[PDB]
Write a protein that binds this ligand. Structure first.
Ligand SMILES: CC(C)=CC(=O)SCCNC(=O)CCNC(=O)[C@H](O)C(C)(C)COP(=O)(O)OP(=O)(O)OC[C@@H]1O[C@H](n2cnc3c(N)ncnc32)[C@@H](O)[C@@H]1OP(=O)(O)O
Ligand SMILES: CC(C)=CC(=O)SCCNC(=O)CCNC(=O)[C@H](O)C(C)(C)COP(=O)(O)OP(=O)(O)OC[C@@H]1O[C@H](n2cnc3c(N)ncnc32)[C@@H](O)[C@@H]1OP(=O)(O)O
Ligand SMILES: CC(C)=CC(=O)SCCNC(=O)CCNC(=O)[C@H](O)C(C)(C)COP(=O)(O)OP(=O)(O)OC[C@@H]1O[C@H](n2cnc3c(N)ncnc32)[C@@H](O)[C@@H]1OP(=O)(O)O
Lengths: 524, 522, 541
């Protein structure tokens, strides 16, 4: 009997309240800023570079992606802000590469396309990191990889940050070989002149498509006709960009792959409240606190939520819901973490792992302005319990940072270091080891005590002098754009699109089967 | 019948030749420089810090490691040069942490000890990278991990490089939890005051040992944690008692090492190792036969070459080190299609027979050949790159000379996850040689300017070349690569045999899995 | 480096103290009583029955077992006191059957022999339970089973307690078939006339050995055949060694007499092609540093007094070496690592009332032992509630369960020894009989029940008084006293170790001086089977 009636979460906010108006105004300003910056990034490398690229008879990378994917299918771009102000004087729109997940011939695939307009397609360190992240996502979710290779190889300056280390350029070929060995299809489309680094990519790909004249593969001489007829590196011969994309679609169709789901499914229903109210509900000030249940009610199917252990450790919210017919276990933050909250989270994570249910984390860690210590030693014994449970979980984990994320709370709530399938942040998020004010006080006290043992007086004025720069540095570093410029936290997302982004991410992540979970020693 | 006689590799070098004398002099100078720098690094954080540390009654980290391991057992320290001149004005001897592999109660274990004298044990980014590398080594080789925790947490400045990212501090706890779940024992000895980051380490460890007064886990103390909070698992009076308890705990692990590969009696090489100084020298332009190096590091100087006359620029064959079968793949010149194919065949054979692989890299500069139709090499170089990546046997890479371009990837570079990687003091690593890079930059700028209609000055090409050559030389230095956690540590060539034996003995703990290969272009 | 020195547990007790003398006297009296009762049980069914059995040319069952096993090898008999005063007027020495573990041709095997002198080998309910327990032990430890079949079938009276139910006689054949399917060898030696129930045993066995004249296998005896169909036939003609060997083909070997049958059984066991391999590491065995007989004085016979379990541990472990785990947290529970005869073991003992900290510490230790694949040994001495009426036991419930689950889900070999009281949920927590330990033993001074007699008496009086008060019936103060005296007596009689041993619970009683030897034999037997991985349920936390 699936007809039983069930109470629904969420409540209607007070639109007339001044707090709602102010929060809505701040969030709208942030979202407009994000949209305009994304537009400028989408503009590309530059006018002259784009003109030359079009004159050569090639298609712009975004046009290539648009023609490659199925008509009208949504595209989930990743890390649009990579390289945003990362380097002092060089502009690298989008990191020089484009990555995302789209549907090709009815199959979800990961697409990696080089933007030839940005430094002739040379690989900056951020470009390598972005490509490695995309490859890791594809390997974890068992998604076929499609490469639109048009690059000039590694950026000769800054070679030390791109060539030598483990997570440097060679890891690309390593991942390609491993994923090929694991039956994850690799398809390389040589849409332009490659280089020594670029040349290896088509060689390791299972199937190659090279354009007649623009495509040129040389290890350091290289052409479509030569590679197709004598060297044999090329697998398909394409007249131009459109023909290459058509051939790629055909090749993807001939993959003989069928997606099968392990989790149960139910008909999808929209949430009972508009998503745009999240602007007023959340606002842009981290000092104020908002109930995460509103956010949950505005992003779940039918606003139906089954809370688990509601009255025990109420600072943490856990329960079961469904997004687009997908069961999910939601773990959100409603305040400071305590021992009871950690135990409740561990219990919920164990339940979800046992039942093979995907997990969703909503992080809003709180500053220590309210509580200086609160005998945090008790928290250590139990915080670890969660950190381990989260790490050992094998179900798909998606983390969304809707507010502050500081200290060990970031690790506890499935931080970037614990390998979530996807990680997103809202435009108002802040991430750092601790808040700037708290950090400033710690540095002043340590220096004063050490100086006192040394016998050097520590000036009271000096403590104030140290505090002002530290607060500014922490604010600049914690910015969402600072974190997105580095490949951490994938990309920033408009709160109004949270439901769609989560649905797409879970649909992509459900491709891989769910394995059994093995836990370590649970310190009692 | 194992009595059959077999020819032995190697030949006696000409000591009287001036080239041998010059090479020996250069290598001796390099080794002396390395030894003195290692001594200074071993000195520690500083005199005042060491005096304060001894005052508080604690033991110095090297003394802790010496007392922990079995008496007289060798210790294989890793990445001794981490943080060497990495930061502009701050000195971080050894990266602030000590990692290595030693035998505790007859069991090989990975030991990670914080040096409290360096910035009070605060974690620099290089410290986090070094600890992560040690944890990865232990996980790959299934070695128990022992932590001598004495740290002040993450360095508050430079927090962005230590806290947030995947390979940042949280990966430590992630690896700890995973290795605990995989039955790899975790033991934490709280030998001093920890912090927020330090506190989590003992919590996630299977067994904890905390000193009575120096140990403080946060408010936090040995008595409190042992009696009321229950975080501590053992109570130790002082450092010596804690080390004794750690030895007992390791003894109670119920673990027995079993080998899959066959073993034979060990025999010493037929030639002295110190002749490698004269044979190799310090000049990368000159070429030396890798067969000499092989003959001076294998048991009895016995080598069975495979495909000797096909692709002679690459040397492959079978030998034994300390009774351990090994497949040696060395460089004798520029890589060609035949060399790539031969290497792929040998790697397939070794993977099929479950034999550990050893790579000796000496990639050559392009001064001799500008292009040589390198397009042919691309089709076949990738076949070797894949074969190397897909291999599941233990792989150890040693860089005895230059390592440039895709040759680094082909010969099991750092990006392809070898179990261990070492470099000799005369090695050079970079994307390409400085001279070659200088020419490429000048040509690209001139051609782009010509299309633009801007004349590119001939003097400008010379102006660009001199700085590029200097930058490439400084970046390629072995100490530059060792300061970053790449290439573990530098090793004296005279100790290559011992280092390889220890590394293979450690790596043989884990069982050898089956190898699955991907699509092959051929 | 295994040469490192290690502190040793245990201390020298004060022999001159009067408490030691009194405890020693009480324990010596108990042990002497146990020894004399065991001697009387070993005497057998009776003089006339033994005389008839010998006159028929057969060997007594104990002689059969002695000749079967390897010369000089120790024999670990199980449940010697089964059926001791179980039935009102019928005496069933040893339950009518003999079970134990011994070495045959260098292989540890489980031996089940029927005592024909007791009721002509008829199966009492206790006999069926004992045989089922032996079969379960053999299946768990993967030990070959040897049956010396000489029985008259199910006891016709009391048939309802032997035939119908799941744990009744048919479970014997079920276990035989399952163990045969799992490559655990089954060998049946028909040493005497069987019956309908007895006949099926040789049929299901992989190999049969039947004596020439004494052995007779008939699916229905002559009297049974006459009752069922009115047919007259001699016992030998209906079922005999020659007939079964030559025409019916049920018999696999033909034996002239008992000695020949035992020799053939030894040969058959030799041709099993089995080699024992150990998974756990081994070390040279060393004797404990203190005499075992001091346990008499240390423990005594009074459960009210408390003794340190560390003494018992120090007197039964190799070299008296013990590595305590979490010594100062939850000190009422003792946990640590030691070695018995070179075998690693995790010891979990009781030193007082169980608390939340003790339960958490036990759960942690059990998880560690399961992860490292180390056998577990439980020493139970649960305490009465005279000291603490409630102590907010609600806190204990939240954490006691965690231990109960951890213990249940463990897959390592578990051996439980009850050295004192075992009451309430503490019995379940410390690997009670319901949680399937490989072996369970009790000392002669142990007491087991749901709660102590005094505590139970108070509970019954209060419940009746409150219910009567709501009813409006006055509950007499004298009535409360009247209810208390019988309850205390019933609890004392039921809790007796002999009461529990008469039923097949707790296997057998063991002299404390032989605890080390018994544990060594039990662990050596249990190490035959490989150690599987352990999967845990939800750890409520
Ligand atoms: C993997 C391993 C193991 C090793 C290797 O991979 S070693 C790879 C060596 N690379 C090459 O061998 C490619 C050399 N390029 C060329 O042959 C072409 O240039 C193309 C193919 C790039 C097409 O580009 P193009 O020629 O059509 O146009 P262009 O405007 O000239 O393109 C931008 C201009 O390139 C300059 N530029 C700066 N850095 C680089 C760089 N690293 N690579 C290429 N170009 C770069 C840029 O600064 C200037 O513009 P700017 O900055 O002055 O405005
Ligand atoms: C994981 C997550 C998620 C979060 C975290 O982990 S947030 C961790 C916050 N850290 C603390 O809360 C520890 C604060 N220390 C202390 O409480 C003590 O100091 C000890 C414990 C360190 C012992 O050291 P000590 O007190 O015995 O000696 P001292 O000489 O004072 O030791 C050197 C002096 O420490 C200065 N110093 C600089 N940077 C740091 C730093 N990051 N931590 C500590 N000290 C630092 C150094 O500059 C000066 O010496 P110098 O450079 O001036 O010569
Ligand atoms: C499995 C399923 C599904 C079904 C079945 O199994 S249905 C099995 C039906 N059983 C028989 O068909 C065997 C009938 N016995 C006989 O044919 C023989 O007796 C032998 C073979 C038992 C040898 O014994 P024996 O003949 O050499 O000596 P005896 O002294 O006579 O032996 C003791 C005397 O047996 C009396 N006695 C009481 N109860 C029984 C009992 N249940 N079975 C046998 N005897 C019993 C005892 O009371 C008296 O002695 P007591 O108590 O008076 O002192």
């Amino acid at each position: 009997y699936h007809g039983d009636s069930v109470a629904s979460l969420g409540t209607q906010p007070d639109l007339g309240s001044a707090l709602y108006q102010e929060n809505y105004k701040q969030m709208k300003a942030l979202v407009n800023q994000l949209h305009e910056r994304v537009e400028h990034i989408k503009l590309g490398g530059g006018e002259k570079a784009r003109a030359l690229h079009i004159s050569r008879g090639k298609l712009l990378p975004r046009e290539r992606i648009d023609n490659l994917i199925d008509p009208g299918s949504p595209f989930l771009e990743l890390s649009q802000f990579a390289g945003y102000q990362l380097y002092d004087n060089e502009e690298v729109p989008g990191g020089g590469i484009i990555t995302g997940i789209g549907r090709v011939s009815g199959v979800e695939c990961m697409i990696i396309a080089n933007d030839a307009t940005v430094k002739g397609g040379a690989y900056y360190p951020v470009t390598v990191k972005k490509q490695l992240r995309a490859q890791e996502i594809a390997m974890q979710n068992r998604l076929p990889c499609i490469y639109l290779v048009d690059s000039g190889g590694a950026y000769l300056p800054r070679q030390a940050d791109v060539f030598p280390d483990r997570d440097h350029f060679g890891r690309t070929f390593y991942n390609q070989a491993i994923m090929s060995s694991k039956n994850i299809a690799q398809i390389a489309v040589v849409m332009g002149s490659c280089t020594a680094g670029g040349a290896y990519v088509p060689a390791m790909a299972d199937e190659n498509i090279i354009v007649r004249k623009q495509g040129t593969i040389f290890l350091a001489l290289g052409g479509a006709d030569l590679h197709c007829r004598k060297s044999g590196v090329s697998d398909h011969w394409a007249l131009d960009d459109h023909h290459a994309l058509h051939l790629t679609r055909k090749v993807v169709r001939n993959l003989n792959y069928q997606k099968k789901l392990d989790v149960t499914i139910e008909p999808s229903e929209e949430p009972l409240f508009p998503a745009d109210e999240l602007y007023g509900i959340v606002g842009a000030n981290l000092k104020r606190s908002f109930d995460v249940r509103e956010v949950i009610a505005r992003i779940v199917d039918g606003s139906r939520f089954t809370e688990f252990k509601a009255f025990y450790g109420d600072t943490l919210v856990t329960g079961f819901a469904r997004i687009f017919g997908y069961p999910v276990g939601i773990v959100g933050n409603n305040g400071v973490l305590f021992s009871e909250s950690a135990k409740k989270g561990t219990h919920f994570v164990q339940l979800c792992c046992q039942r093979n249910i995907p997990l969703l984390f909503l992080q809003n860690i709180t500053g220590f302005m309210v509580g200086r210590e609160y005998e945090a030693e008790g928290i250590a014994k139990d915080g670890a319990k969660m950190v381990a449970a989260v790490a050992c979980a094998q179900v798909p984990k998606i983390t969304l940072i809707i507010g502050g994320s500081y200290g060990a709370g970031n690790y506890g709530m499935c931080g970037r270091a614990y390998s979530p399938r996807f990680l997103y942040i809202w435009p108002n998020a802040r991430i750092s080891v601790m808040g700037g004010e708290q950090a400033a006080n710690v540095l002043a006290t340590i220096t004063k005590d050490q100086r006192a043992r040394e016998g050097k007086q520590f000036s009271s004025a000096d403590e104030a002098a140290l505090k002002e720069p530290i607060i500014k540095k922490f604010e600049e570093e914690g910015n969402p754009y600072y974190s997105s410029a580095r490949v951490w936290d994938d990309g920033i997302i408009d709160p109004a699109d949270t439901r769609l982004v989560l649905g797409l991410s879970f649909s992509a992540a459900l491709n891989a089967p769910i394995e059994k979970t093995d836990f370590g020693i649970f310190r009692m």
